[PDB]
Amino acid sequence: RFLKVKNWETEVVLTDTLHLKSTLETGCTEYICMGSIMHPSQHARRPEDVATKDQLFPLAKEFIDQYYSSIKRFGSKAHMERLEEVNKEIDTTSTYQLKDTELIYGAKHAWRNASRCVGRIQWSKLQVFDARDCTTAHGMFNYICNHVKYATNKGNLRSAITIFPQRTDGKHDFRVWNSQLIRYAGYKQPDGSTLGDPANVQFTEICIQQGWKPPRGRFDVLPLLLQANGNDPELFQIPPELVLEVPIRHPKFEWFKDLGLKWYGLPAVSNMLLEIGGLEFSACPFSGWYMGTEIGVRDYCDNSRYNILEEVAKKMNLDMRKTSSLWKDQALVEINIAVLYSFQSDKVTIVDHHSATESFIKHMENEYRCRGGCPADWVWIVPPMSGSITPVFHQEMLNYRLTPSFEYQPDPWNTHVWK
Amino acid sequence: RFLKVKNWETEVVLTDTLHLKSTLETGCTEYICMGSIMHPRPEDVATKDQLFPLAKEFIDQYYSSIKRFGSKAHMERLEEVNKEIDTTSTYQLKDTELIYGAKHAWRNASRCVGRIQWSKLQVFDARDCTTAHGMFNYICNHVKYATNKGNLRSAITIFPQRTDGKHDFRVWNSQLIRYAGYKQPDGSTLGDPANVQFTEICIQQGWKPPRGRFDVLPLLLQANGNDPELFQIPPELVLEVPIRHPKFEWFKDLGLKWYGLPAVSNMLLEIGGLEFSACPFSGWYMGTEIGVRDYCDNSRYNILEEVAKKMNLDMRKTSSLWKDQALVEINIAVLYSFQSDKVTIVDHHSATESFIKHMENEYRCRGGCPADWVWIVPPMSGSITPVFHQEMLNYRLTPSFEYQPDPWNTHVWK
Numbered sequence: 001r002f003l004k005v006k007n008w009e010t011e012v013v014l015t016d017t018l019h020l021k022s023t024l025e026t027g028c029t030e031y032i033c034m035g036s037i038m039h040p041s042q043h044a045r046r047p048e049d050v051a052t053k054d055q056l057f058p059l060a061k062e063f064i065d066q067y068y069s070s071i072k073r074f075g076s077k078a079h080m081e082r083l084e085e086v087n088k089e090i091d092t093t094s095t096y097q098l099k100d101t102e103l104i105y106g107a108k109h110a111w112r113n114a115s116r117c118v119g120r121i122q123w124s125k126l127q128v129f130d131a132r133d134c135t136t137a138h139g140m141f142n143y144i145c146n147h148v149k150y151a152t153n154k155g156n157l158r159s160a161i162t163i164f165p166q167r168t169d170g171k172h173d174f175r176v177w178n179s180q181l182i183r184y185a186g187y188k189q190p191d192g193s194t195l196g197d198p199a200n201v202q203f204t205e206i207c208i209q210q211g212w213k214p215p216r217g218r219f220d221v222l223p224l225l226l227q228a229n230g231n232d233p234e235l236f237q238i239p240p241e242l243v244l245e246v247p248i249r250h251p252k253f254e255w256f257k258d259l260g261l262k263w264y265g266l267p268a269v270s271n272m273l274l275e276i277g278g279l280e281f282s283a284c285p286f287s288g289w290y291m292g293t294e295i296g297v298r299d300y301c302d303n304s305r306y307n308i309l310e311e312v313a314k315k316m317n318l319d320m321r322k323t324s325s326l327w328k329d330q331a332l333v334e335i336n337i338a339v340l341y342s343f344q345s346d347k348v349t350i351v352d353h354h355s356a357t358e359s360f361i362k363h364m365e366n367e368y369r370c371r372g373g374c375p376a377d378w379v380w381i382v383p384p385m386s387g388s389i390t391p392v393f394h395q396e397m398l399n400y401r402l403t404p405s406f407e408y409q410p411d412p413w414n415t416h417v418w419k
Numbered sequence: 420r421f422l423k424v425k426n427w428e429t430e431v432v433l434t435d436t437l438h439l440k441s442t443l444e445t446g447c448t449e450y451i452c453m454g455s456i457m458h459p460r461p462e463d464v465a466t467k468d469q470l471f472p473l474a475k476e477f478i479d480q481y482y483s484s485i486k487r488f489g490s491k492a493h494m495e496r497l498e499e500v501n502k503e504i505d506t507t508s509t510y511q512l513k514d515t516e517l518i519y520g521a522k523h524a525w526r527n528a529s530r531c532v533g534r535i536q537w538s539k540l541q542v543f544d545a546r547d548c549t550t551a552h553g554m555f556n557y558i559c560n561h562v563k564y565a566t567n568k569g570n571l572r573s574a575i576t577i578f579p580q581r582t583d584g585k586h587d588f589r590v591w592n593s594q595l596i597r598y599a600g601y602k603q604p605d606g607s608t609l610g611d612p613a614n615v616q617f618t619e620i621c622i623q624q625g626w627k628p629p630r631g632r633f634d635v636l637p638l639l640l641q642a643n644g645n646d647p648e649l650f651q652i653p654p655e656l657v658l659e660v661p662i663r664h665p666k667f668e669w670f671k672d673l674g675l676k677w678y679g680l681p682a683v684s685n686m687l688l689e690i691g692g693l694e695f696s697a698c699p700f701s702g703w704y705m706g707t708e709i710g711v712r713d714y715c716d717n718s719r720y721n722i723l724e725e726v727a728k729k730m731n732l733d734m735r736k737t738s739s740l741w742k743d744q745a746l747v748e749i750n751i752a753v754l755y756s757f758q759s760d761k762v763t764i765v766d767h768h769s770a771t772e773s774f775i776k777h778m779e780n781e782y783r784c785r786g787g788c789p790a791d792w793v794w795i796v797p798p799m800s801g802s803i804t805p806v807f808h809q810e811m812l813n814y815r816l817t818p819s820f821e822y823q824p825d826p827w828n829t830h831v832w833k
């Protein structure tokens with residue numbers, strides 16, 4: 001009915017009514033909890049392809065209602081005319097178009113509703129680039145380059161999203177085939193090993209299959225593979241002056257820079273779907289700045305990623321014959337000190353996991369205060385190292401699905417019928 | 420009728436059918452997940468009609484486990500149970516059923532990473548106990564047996580079940596061996612800040628506290644709903660480990676030690692609708708339990724700052740990761756010390772690897788393995804252990820270990 005959450009480190013209790021506004025299933029039942037499943041539910045708000053009027057209109061009415069409620073109208077002349085406008089538009093085209101204000105509101109609130117995101121305290125400070133007039137892969141490349149340059153801002157990174165045209169019938173989708181705008185290639189070696197980023201071996205091979213000439217190194221920035229109005233995707237090389245990179249060095253270990261490691265500065269998720277009032281923006285790359293652990297814990301130390309732990313430990317002179325020496329744990333901490341020290345030295349925006357999780361607790365406080373709640377996914381919010389010495393580990397969280405939202409979608413190469 | 424879980428590190432996919440046998444609530448609803456909530460009346464003892472199907476489900480389950488389902492003995496046992504429930508409004512487990520139930524409450528404990536050992540559990544039947552002196556005796560023997568001079572063995576001692584709710588046996592301690600905590604007038608804390616409240620209850624019951632940093636608390640034992648009574652565990656039965664560091668000479672000078680035996684004593688064991696309110700159980704420690712939570716939680720011994728200082732760490736900015744660095748060294752020390760003293764302990768890498776092997780076997784032979792990711796993933800270095808990348812389904816099977824209200828919140832003093 002009305003659910004409370006407690007922090008066990010501070011005893012603060014917060015009361016949640018916002019969850020009553022949730023629409024989509026979490027995947028859980030009274031009998032099974034799916035909170036650690038990556039993709040627990042397939043409960044979509046609209047059917048397969050182009051929906052009928054009685055399917056799309058009720059979703060549209062909900063979002064318009066919420067937007068006009070947001071700005072202290074509801075029932076105002078502009079609201080009631082907007083409903084009639086959307087109504088006639090679905091009648092004559094089977095879809096509708098968002099005003100600039102509604103589009104910005106929807107993007108910002110999909111970020112606000114992103115239960116898995118620890119960075120949401122900045123949710124209302126998002127730059128929205130309307131790219132809905134785009135018609136070709138070349139135009140998409142231009143929009144994406146402007147996005148990257150604006151968001152990088154010479155190291156003082158800025159949150160931004162660029163929104164390409166919504167889905168119509170499902171055959172004219174706009175898609176960025178890259179999962180992130182900037183990633184490193186991954187190469188399947190003949191001796192079975194892997195050079196570069198193993199996560200991207202398959203996408204790297206699609207690029208080569210499309211004509212990309214791989215330099216075959218450890219940190220090869222992948223090309224963009226852009227799809228517009230359902231046509232075959234096209235390759236573009238991001239101008240390197242636009243790809244800001246931080247060489248990784250360590251403030252005490254002088255031998256660290258000799259590892260020859262660097263990472264890119266801009267994290268830009270480009271494979272997700274943005275859902276606003278029943279409309280589906282299948283290409284909506286968004287970016288912010290890194291939490292240190294994303295690079296130094298997951299990108300470098302995951303077994304199926306760069307996996308540098310052994311090397312860093314060996315250089316550190318660590319006993320690697322037994323787990324109980326905690327050599328992995330020791331190297332892991334040093335790598336993350338190095339990542340943070342390098343980014344801060346080159347004046348590139350980065351946030352450590354202590355600061356980020358502390359900010360999120362504050363964001364929670366504000367949201368329960370003004371909004372009646374904040375959906376949060378503990379399994380994702382807690383950092384992947386030193387969990388219990390950050391304040392979120394000790395914070396109970398309720399998870400529920402609010403719209404507008406970011407959703408996953410299939411990879412286009414499982415879907416796309418070439419020509 | 421199927422559910423699949425995937426490992427995102429290995430790509431292994433398992434299929435859970437066992438969740439169809441769950442019958443009690445997770446706390447989640449179809450529209451909101453309560454997976455991170457920690458806890459989603461005395462007269463609430465079960466009626467005759469409530470007890471009938473619970474008992475049947477468990478007896479059926481037990482005879483299925485021993486390949487005698489439907490058999491003559493299964494049907495007469497069923498008849499025998501339903502007779503007792505008619506006459507007495509309760510029933511009594513056979514010894515075999517008690518051992519099976521205690522083992523399967525551990526097997527079903529979704530928050531326990533240590534369940535690879537569930538079938539090797541020593542069950543001490545203390546259902547004939549009637550006084551707190553009797554409970555003291557049972558518990559001392561448990562401690563001595565489980566400690567085994569540092570070669571720890573898992574065990575549980577089961578006291579008489581709940582009857583009307585007015586005659587409960589309880590161990591008032593939360594664990595069998597914990598250190599006392601004392602608030603000072605200046606607001607500081609001596610010992611373990613977790614146990615300040617319980618230390619005060621003991622002091623008020625007559626305990627004369629040494630007022631030191633590592634005073635083993637006395638046992639506070641309640642038999643048959645009477646007022647609880649104090650007893651001092653004989654100090655020769657409490658194995659302890661001084662914490663030193665293999666590289667840092669100065670670490671021993673912190674004066675740190677910990678007990679060898681983790682023995683949870685505040686939970687309720689539920690078998691076939693019967694409720695065993697006093698059922699202390701014990702295993703051996705995973706290092707991070709002591710190194711991360713016990714020593715470094717801000718609400719606990721809180722020695723991160725002290726260790727970082729002796730490490731010459733820059734503690735001006737969080738981004739130096741001085742807290743992280745100090746946490747690893749403490750956990751190195753905890754493991755080194757227990758191993759040097761040949762006191763059983765398990766590090767989080769070994770423990771989580773074993774649990775993945777356990778989980779896969781449980782999917783093989785049982786159709787699943789209920790698991791609570793929020794508890795199974797260790798409190799440090801989470802993503803470099805294999806459970807972090809393992810999807811898990813959480814659901815509640817019985818027999819089960821349950822939380823219960825603290826006894827001083829509900830006891831009716833005589």
Ligand code: HEM
Pocket residue numbers: 111114116117118119120122126159160161286287288289290291294298351356380406
């Ligand atoms: C500005 C600084 C930001 C920080 C520090 C941050 C931090 C994070 C982190 C650490 C994760 C988990 C990633 C992982 O470990 O795999 C995450 C997830 C996510 N972030 Fe943020 N983020 C930021 C900005 C944004 C922005 C601008 C958006 C959208 C406009 C956004 C939307 C999301 C979404 C939708 C997810 C979860 C998606 C999924 O389920 O995979 N974030 N964030």
Ligand code: HEM
Pocket residue numbers: 525528530531532533534536540573574575700701702703704705708765770794820
């Ligand atoms: C033998 C070695 C064992 C290991 C290494 C082990 C490890 C753990 C750990 C690390 C936890 C989480 C503790 C925390 O962080 O608060 C836990 C929880 C638990 N253990 Fe085990 N354990 C062991 C034995 C046992 C035994 C013998 C039993 C019962 C017979 C048991 C029942 C439980 C239960 C019921 C919980 C969770 C209670 C709850 O909060 O729901 N464990 N275990």
Ligand SMILES: CNCCc1cc(F)c(F)c(OCc2cc(C)cc(N)n2)c1
Pocket residue numbers: 267268269272286287288289290291294298
């Ligand atoms: C194994 N991890 C999965 C990787 C992953 C998958 C997603 F689907 C995300 F959405 C994501 O977001 C990461 C992110 C996004 C932004 C905008 C800023 C920031 N610092 N980090 C990360």
Ligand SMILES: CNCCc1cc(F)c(F)c(OCc2cc(C)cc(N)n2)c1
Pocket residue numbers: 681682683700701702703704705708712
């Ligand atoms: C600090 N978190 C809360 C503490 C806590 C709460 C519980 F409800 C437990 F059940 C528990 O069990 C800890 C345990 C038990 C056994 C038998 C072995 C072992 N190694 N650890 C610990």
Ligand SMILES: C[C@H](O)[C@H](O)[C@H]1CNc2nc(N)[nH]c(=O)c2N1
Pocket residue numbers: 008393394395396397455456457793794795
């Ligand atoms: C709020 C949150 O669920 C709580 O802090 C949990 C998180 N996970 C945990 N995991 C374990 N093993 N032990 C704990 O005490 C906790 N505490």
Ligand SMILES: C[C@H](O)[C@H](O)[C@H]1CNc2nc(N)[nH]c(=O)c2N1
Pocket residue numbers: 036037038379380381427807808809810811
């Ligand atoms: C199985 C598990 O759900 C999966 O490995 C999750 C766990 N938590 C995570 N948390 C974050 N931030 N990012 C992730 O990719 C994951 N992966």
Ligand SMILES: [Zn+2]
Pocket residue numbers: 028032033034035447451452453454
């Ligand atoms: Zn759930």
